[PDB]
Amino acid sequence: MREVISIHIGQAGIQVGNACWELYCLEHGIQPDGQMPDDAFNTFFSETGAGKHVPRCIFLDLEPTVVDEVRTGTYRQLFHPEQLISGKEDAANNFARGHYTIGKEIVDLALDRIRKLADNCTGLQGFLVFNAVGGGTGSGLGSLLLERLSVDYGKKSKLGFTVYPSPQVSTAVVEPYNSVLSTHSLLEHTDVAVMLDNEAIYDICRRSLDIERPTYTNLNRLIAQVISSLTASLRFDGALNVDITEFQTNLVPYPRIHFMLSSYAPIISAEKAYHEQLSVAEITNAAFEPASMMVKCDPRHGKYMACCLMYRGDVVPKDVNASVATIKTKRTIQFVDWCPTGFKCGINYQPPTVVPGGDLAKVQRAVCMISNSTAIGEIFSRLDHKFDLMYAKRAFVHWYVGEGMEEGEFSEAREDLAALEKDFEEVGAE
Amino acid sequence: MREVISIHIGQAGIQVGNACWELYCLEHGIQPDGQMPDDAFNTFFSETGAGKHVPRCIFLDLEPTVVDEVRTGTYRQLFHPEQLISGKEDAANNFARGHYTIGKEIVDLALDRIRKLADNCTGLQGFLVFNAVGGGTGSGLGSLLLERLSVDYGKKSKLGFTVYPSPQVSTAVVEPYNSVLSTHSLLEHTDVAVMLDNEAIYDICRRSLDIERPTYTNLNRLIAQVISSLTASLRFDGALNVDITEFQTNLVPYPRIHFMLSSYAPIISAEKAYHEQLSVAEITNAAFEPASMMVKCDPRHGKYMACCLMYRGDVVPKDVNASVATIKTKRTIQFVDWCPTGFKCGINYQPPTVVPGGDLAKVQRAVCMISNSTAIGEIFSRLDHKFDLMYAKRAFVHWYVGEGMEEGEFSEAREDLAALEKDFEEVGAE
Amino acid sequence: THATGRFSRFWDRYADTSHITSVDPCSASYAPSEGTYVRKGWGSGDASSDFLTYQGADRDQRARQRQAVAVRTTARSEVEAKLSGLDDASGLDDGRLQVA
Amino acid sequence: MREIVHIQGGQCGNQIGAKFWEVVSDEHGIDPTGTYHGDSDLQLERINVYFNEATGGRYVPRAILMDLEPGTMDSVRSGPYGQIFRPDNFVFGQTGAGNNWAKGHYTEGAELIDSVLDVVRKEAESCDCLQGFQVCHSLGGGTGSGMGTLLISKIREEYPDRMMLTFSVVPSPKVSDTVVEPYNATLSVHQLVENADECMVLDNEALYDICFRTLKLTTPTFGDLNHLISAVMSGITCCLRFPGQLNADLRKLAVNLIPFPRLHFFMVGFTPLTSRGSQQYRALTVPELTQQMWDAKNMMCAADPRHGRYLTASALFRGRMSTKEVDEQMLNVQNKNSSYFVEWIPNNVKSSVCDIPPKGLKMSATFIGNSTAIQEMFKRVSEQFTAMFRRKAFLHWYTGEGMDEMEFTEAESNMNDLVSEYQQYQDASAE
Numbered sequence A, B: 001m002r003e004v005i006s007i008h009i010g011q012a013g014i015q016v017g018n019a020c021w022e023l024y025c026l027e028h029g030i031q032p033d034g035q036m037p038d039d040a041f042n043t044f045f046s047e048t049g050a051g052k053h054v055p056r057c058i059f060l061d062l063e064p065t066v067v068d069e070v071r072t073g074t075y076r077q078l079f080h081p082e083q084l085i086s087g088k089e090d091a092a093n094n095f096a097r098g099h100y101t102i103g104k105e106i107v108d109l110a111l112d113r114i115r116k117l118a119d120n121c122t123g124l125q126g127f128l129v130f131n132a133v134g135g136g137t138g139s140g141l142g143s144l145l146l147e148r149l150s151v152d153y154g155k156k157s158k159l160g161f162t163v164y165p166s167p168q169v170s171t172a173v174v175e176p177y178n179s180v181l182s183t184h185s186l187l188e189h190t191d192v193a194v195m196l197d198n199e200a201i202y203d204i205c206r207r208s209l210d211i212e213r214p215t216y217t218n219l220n221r222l223i224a225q226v227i228s229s230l231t232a233s234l235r236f237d238g239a240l241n242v243d244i245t246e247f248q249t250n251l252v253p254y255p256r257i258h259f260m261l262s263s264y265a266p267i268i269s270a271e272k273a274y275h276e277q278l279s280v281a282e283i284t285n286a287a288f289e290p291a292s293m294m295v296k297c298d299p300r301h302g303k304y305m306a307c308c309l310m311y312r313g314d315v316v317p318k319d320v321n322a323s324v325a326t327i328k329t330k331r332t333i334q335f336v337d338w339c340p341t342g343f344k345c346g347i348n349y350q351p352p353t354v355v356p357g358g359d360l361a362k363v364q365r366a367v368c369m370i371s372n373s374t375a376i377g378e379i380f381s382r383l384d385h386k387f388d389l390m391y392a393k394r395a396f397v398h399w400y401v402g403e404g405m406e407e408g409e410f411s412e413a414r415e416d417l418a419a420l421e422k423d424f425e426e427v428g429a430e
Numbered sequence C: 001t002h003a004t005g006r007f008s009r010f011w012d013r014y015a016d017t018s019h020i021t022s023v024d025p026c027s028a029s030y031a032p033s034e035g036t037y038v039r040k041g042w043g044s045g046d047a048s049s050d051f052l053t054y055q056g057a058d059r060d061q062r063a064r065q066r067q068a069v070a071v072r073t074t075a076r077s078e079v080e081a082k083l084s085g086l087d088d089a090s091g092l093d094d095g096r097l098q099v100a
Numbered sequence D: 001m002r003e004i005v006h007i008q009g010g011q012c013g014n015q016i017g018a019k020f021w022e023v024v025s026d027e028h029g030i031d032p033t034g035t036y037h038g039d040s041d042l043q044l045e046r047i048n049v050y051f052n053e054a055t056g057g058r059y060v061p062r063a064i065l066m067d068l069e070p071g072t073m074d075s076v077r078s079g080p081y082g083q084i085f086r087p088d089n090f091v092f093g094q095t096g097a098g099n100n101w102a103k104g105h106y107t108e109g110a111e112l113i114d115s116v117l118d119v120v121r122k123e124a125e126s127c128d129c130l131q132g133f134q135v136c137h138s139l140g141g142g143t144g145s146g147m148g149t150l151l152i153s154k155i156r157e158e159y160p161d162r163m164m165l166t167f168s169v170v171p172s173p174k175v176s177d178t179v180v181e182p183y184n185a186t187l188s189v190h191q192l193v194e195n196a197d198e199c200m201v202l203d204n205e206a207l208y209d210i211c212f213r214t215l216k217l218t219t220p221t222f223g224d225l226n227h228l229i230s231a232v233m234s235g236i237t238c239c240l241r242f243p244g245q246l247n248a249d250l251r252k253l254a255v256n257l258i259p260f261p262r263l264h265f266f267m268v269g270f271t272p273l274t275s276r277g278s279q280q281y282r283a284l285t286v287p288e289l290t291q292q293m294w295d296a297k298n299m300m301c302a303a304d305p306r307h308g309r310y311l312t313a314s315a316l317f318r319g320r321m322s323t324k325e326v327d328e329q330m331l332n333v334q335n336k337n338s339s340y341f342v343e344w345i346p347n348n349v350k351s352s353v354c355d356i357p358p359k360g361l362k363m364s365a366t367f368i369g370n371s372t373a374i375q376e377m378f379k380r381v382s383e384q385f386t387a388m389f390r391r392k393a394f395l396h397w398y399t400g401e402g403m404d405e406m407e408f409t410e411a412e413s414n415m416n417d418l419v420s421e422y423q424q425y426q427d428a429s430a431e
């Protein structure tokens, strides 16, 4: 009745989906084969007459390798074979390639399977789209898919957990280009966009988990924990239930402003676990710590507009109220003048499950802080000059033009991002 | 974490490096093959995944014979083959030959390997440069390498354990010439220079070890013991730890005045061992004895500027305080008026390991006293007349000019050494 | 036998040329075949750890360093216990008193 | 399922291709008879990128061999892995090109090119999806340079969208083998600029220097240089063949490497190259691999990067590694050597990670550097070409093969224009 359809686009999307679905299977007790030894799985799994549970997900990629890895791994009997969709040619970090030439037939088939999945859901809370801003598959095909979803499904709540390029460290060169293009695309399509930065999550793993060599598996595990905490209110009952529809109502001040910083707490290894109290106030303070942000964006620069707090485990409303009162009284944290409350608390009685082989410890309390704040304009400011720095010489522009784009598209995307900067400045200003 | 890069230049540098690395292998249990049957070796050795340990050392020489002796001896499987750098033509005791014509390509390759060595070190306490002032390789190439190190690495502490010509006994004729040149070079590059004299160490061996026929192996063993005592605080824990960076803070009052006398105690054969108590006070008195100096420079002529003691073995702060109080009360030991304390005591719990095949006995206590004193101006005064006596007749000046030097270089070196004399006199005077 | 008459008189043309990836087993570079072919192993925690050897290697290095430090500290603390046990209570002058 | 059509041209190209196919068959566990003996599923998972299944378990390389003399193809057939190739893909003429680009491009190459294109079309149509073609050959030789450029032009005409990758052995700076190397190189570079999408420049003297200084070999035959080249050729496409933590195909590398269409020449290097003596002494960490990778001596191009400016640089790492460690190493290199990296590109490194290292090695890394340093190589080739062309030495053979003298001027002008572009982006200032 509370079904949520998951979409994973690109290598990053599929690799975070692996962690997400491992976490969901461990949380609901579903074995990798597909079946488990009430109805809390309906949000993520649909059961068949045989008793086997198949996830309501769609793994989309234009490259065969990542999807074939899932087809060969442990979860080969879990996912639907046609739900795993593989392309033939990779988008090659090209937004034009993933949006205009290669992405067409793939997105058509993706909408076909998405319609088939949604036809099996009584209710539908929304879509959880996990892609990579900075790659042709993630940016271009993801943008096209989101546009088609907006056209056909309409008002269904699409939550995009996007990974944006880190400020200094990066793995691609055309990353500012296709990131700007995808941001222009999704400014008008996704309902709530959550920013994620690999640099910030690397720092989180290095400091909190004491992993001197963090990797994509650890990053995806942390992101999966964040998403599971975000969705726990759909699957398990508790005081102060918060819903997908309530996220926008209590977090988005205006339709343009829906990009959100995410932070999980606690992030502590087993050896360092059970050395601190991990009370509600302490974990809330840790969640509000700027270092704990999963985005390289210091919130002290901006002003918080809304903050949704998802508590898991032995959490009581008196403790959440005391912690939030202390947070409000703290001088470092600053809220906008036109939002007196700016807080949306939701508690759940299910503690976060621990993935065997992971680094996170078994903690009885957890917080996921998702905040809309005007500080997020900083990352767009960085990408806006990283874009125009290359765009001045028109470097790598022929690559994008060759697959059916125009210089006008680059100009429009840059102008739209400038307008987004201006809107953030305006909403921040009194 | 506390890595120190060792450079050994010339025949004397490599020959003392042989003793130093034999002592380090014996101290850490590292077999000559390379591997041992924690992380105390990291200061001097870098370990590979195979468990084999390779020293962070560089054997630089323009002569092939000395390095090939290492390549053929027992430690052929220990040292890094490319780290052993061999020249084709010897410098022929010519500072110009080793500094202007032959030394160029060799020092380029040396900086290449030094960059490779330093890139493998997380931390870097500094460099230990062991050269021979008084030979073309040691003086010229050593000066060039020190200048390049100062240019590129910058603030890394370079401790130069230099060997100056003895007052009366010597083996070369142009030794005053290239010694003056190298002194002018290293007055402005090395951070802490340690003075050494073969005559003084010969006297130590003859009087204390009762060796009527001391040789270079004995001298290098004593020098290796001194350096190991100096670096023991980096590898082994103990009360009052001392650091390479702390040598500069607690030993050199001024950048110009950084030349230091070194003295070890006890120097006793096993025949004379266990005939005396060898208490802390007695070994401190022996260390402050002028005959125990490894430089032919009577400290009575000058005044002590600073004195760093490094104790090894069963030494307690109460005993070291009693010994230092007695030393301060002693009238023959004289300190400058502007340095009331002038003492830097540091203890280590690791007794000095005894080299099988050496003449030193196994002593549970050891002292290494490194002292800045104004008396050291005497040796420069000796070289300054030994130099100008030859320079008046311009003997062997054609040899130096033939490889691209000028009379101006000799004049500048002489003037700089005179300025150093004047500085020593000024700091000695009230 | 499949070689034609030309280029079979001299087989020195087709040398081993295996100096690339010629890393000796004793070298730190060597990796066995079972070590090369490994998957991410999302489903199995053991498989994930096998993929992430370097994290496990770092954990083991830290554990070994801490254990060595603990052993050294225990031995040393026994040493100061023996040293500080010496006081007026210990019979240091008992022999002198007996002789007198 | 993203197939690559390999093509070998001339004696040097055929030798390099034979060594490359030996290396790839060893990596995939393919014995010289073609049967699979690798005992690993990942080896057979993506074997179809390079090989096709025969009647039995035999696997045939998707390679097409060209020559004007049958001797080199007899040698390739007689080599240890000579029996994997299908005999029909051996296309040979009868009279070789006398180191004459004109002979290999116009007179003798014209007749054989029809059969060459027939074989290429036959191999490409069998492919499900075609990533593109990789052509290994040597600039400065008649049949190699000439027929290679002609075939590259033909394949560009037939398959414009498909990737074209070239491994060209540019004549070495100091020691030259043949006299007409400047002529052949000048004529071939002009063709590669217009046709080749992606081109690695390789030098026998760079290979000799690296095998003397890094590998410290004593008597390095051409097999060793071919083996280094083959290691690079494998490492470039290992992301297509093996699962990767952050995979990157040929098109992705080309996109992230090529800022402008004409600036598609690269210097490549393979790590870790360790001398037999220092193999135990070296410890393989990602920083060690990066330090050897960015060294100028490791580059297999004669031009040293220190003179030029890195426009872009891709690094394909292989082995169980930390993506954070790799990215941190790349960022640290960029920050330390920011003077050597172009300012108007904020990030000049395309980092890729593959989960399967080469056999025996714990980790490896191949490098592709697009830097303005290659300007000096083309400049030196010009310095020889213009000197010889002023007096028109050896011009009479090229004229007697039926190609105009104005073609030399056009090729020289194009190569000088490429040099000018490289200099322009070397000294280009932001804003």
Ligand SMILES: Nc1nc2c(ncn2[C@@H]2O[C@H](COP(=O)(O)OP(=O)(O)OP(=O)(O)O)[C@@H](O)[C@H]2O)c(=O)[nH]1
Residues within 6 Å of the ligand: A009, A010, A011, A012, A013, A015, A016, A061, A063, A066, A090, A091, A092, A093, A094, A098, A132, A134, A135, A136, A137, A138, A139, A163, A171, A172, A175, A197, A198, A216, A217, A219, A220, D245, D246, D247, D248, D252
């Ligand atoms: N946080 C995180 N980011 C990832 C992960 N894997 C990939 N990314 C990011 O995803 C971006 C590229 O993703 P994709 O577009 O899917 O790469 P691809 O599948 O080859 O598709 P194209 O790059 O468009 O050709 C990179 O810039 C990475 O920063 C991951 O596991 N975790």
Ligand SMILES: Nc1nc2c(ncn2[C@@H]2O[C@H](COP(=O)(O)OP(=O)(O)OP(=O)(O)O)[C@@H](O)[C@H]2O)c(=O)[nH]1
Residues within 6 Å of the ligand: B009, B010, B011, B012, B013, B015, B016, B061, B063, B066, B090, B091, B092, B093, B094, B098, B132, B133, B134, B135, B136, B137, B138, B139, B163, B171, B172, B175, B197, B198, B216, B217, B219, B220
């Ligand atoms: N203390 C000590 N000094 C040494 C030893 N061996 C050589 N020396 C000194 O080193 C000086 C010359 O050293 P080098 O410059 O290295 O001699 P080389 O290797 O032939 O190089 P060049 O003489 O410069 O051409 C001599 O004057 C000796 O006094 C040694 O084993 N111990």
Ligand SMILES: Nc1nc2c(ncn2[C@@H]2O[C@H](COP(=O)(O)OP(=O)(O)O)[C@@H](O)[C@H]2O)c(=O)[nH]1
Residues within 6 Å of the ligand: D009, D010, D011, D012, D013, D015, D016, D096, D097, D099, D138, D139, D140, D141, D142, D143, D144, D145, D169, D177, D178, D204, D222, D223, D225, D226
């Ligand atoms: N790396 C490498 N270079 C070679 C080999 N054989 C020849 N060369 C070089 O390639 C250059 C061109 O020769 P090539 O093009 O093969 O002659 P062609 O086949 O008649 O055109 C010569 O100058 C050789 O120095 C080889 O096996 N490996």
